[PDB]
Amino acid sequence: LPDLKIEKLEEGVFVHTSFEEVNGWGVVTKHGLVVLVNTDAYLIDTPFTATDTEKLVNWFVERGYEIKGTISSHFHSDSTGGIEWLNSQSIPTYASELTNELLKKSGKVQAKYSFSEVSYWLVKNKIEVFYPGPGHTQDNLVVWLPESKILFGGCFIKPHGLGNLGDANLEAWPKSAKILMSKYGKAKLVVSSHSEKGDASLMKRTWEQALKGLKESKKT
Ligand code: NA
Ligand SMILES: [Zn+2]
Ligand SMILES: [Zn+2]
């Protein structure tokens, strides 16, 4: 299993990359962020495992940062796998009320703190959590960093194909993708869960893939 990677994007923004075996043939790649406000650190998604969440936290703690909070972009384990471990360390975990309902329904440990607001400022003027509407999942969120114009699109941003449709809302995805394009056109960088980082055009590529997936589902 490849090791957790940490890469600096700019001052105050790091991408964490963790890996999971799909079964014998190679691995899934998952990107999240760590955002620094002075000496406060915020996890944007957890790695898949408690073990990789602890490695990630330990890397920032050793450099004099305090983990002030985590946000999970959706209920799937690639965003939420570390919540139980973070809770055991009394590190504040956040998810939307809908995300916590979906964790509870799937027999998973919930985030300690939840919110209902469509636009939720995890950190005033620094970290915005936004619900564009259903897509990859009913609850999928994005995270916007206004000072860097970095959008973390999580598993919503799907420039090359929508992936697993098990929990997806194909009827809503195109509308949700246009809402995102319309709000975050000033984005300098779009970081997705499962693809290479890109420019604002990844939001339009997602819209196109959403339209195509909906069209194909209506044919059969
Ligand atoms: Na450092
Ligand atoms: Zn997912
Ligand atoms: Zn994912």
Author numbering: 4 to 223
Anything the authors wrote about it?
IMP-13, a member of subgroup 2, sharing 92.3% amino acid sequence similarity with IMP-2 and 82.5% with IMP-1, was first identified in the Gram-negative pathogen Pseudomonas aeruginosa from clinical samples in Italy and is a common cause of carbapenem resistance, often involved in large outbreaks. Imipenemases represent one of the major groups of class B1 metallo-β-lactamases found in Gram-negative pathogens, and these enzymes can hydrolyze all bicyclic β-lactam antibiotics. The overall protein architecture of the IMP-13 apo structure is consistent with that of the previously published metallo-β-lactamase fold, consisting of a global αβ/βα topology with a shallow active-site cleft at the border of the two β-sheets. The structural information and dynamics presented here reveal important information about the mechanism of antibiotic binding, as well as a significant role for the active-site-covering loop (L1), indicating that the plasticity of the active-site region is important for the broad substrate recognition spectrum of these enzymes.
In the apo-state crystal structures, two positions for the L1 loop, open and closed, were observed. The L1 loop adopts very different conformations in the two apo structures (apoclosed and apoopen). In the apoclosed structure, the loop is folded over the active site, while in the apoopen structure, L1 is extended away from the protein, leaving the active site accessible. We define the open conformation to be the loop pointing away from the protein toward the solvent and the closed conformation to be the loop positioned over the active site and pointing toward its rim. The distance between C-α atoms of Trp28 for the open and closed conformations is 8.8 Å. With the apoopen structure, on the other hand, the loop can be seen to point away from the active site, leaving the active site accessible to the substrate. The tunnel formation seen in the closed form is completely absent due to the different positioning of both backbone and side chain atoms. On the other hand, the ability of the loop to adopt a fully open state, as observed in the apoopen structure of IMP-13, provides an alternative strategy for inhibitor development. As the loop appears to play an active role in the binding of ligands to the protein, prevention of the loop closing by an allosteric inhibitor could have a similar inhibitory effect.
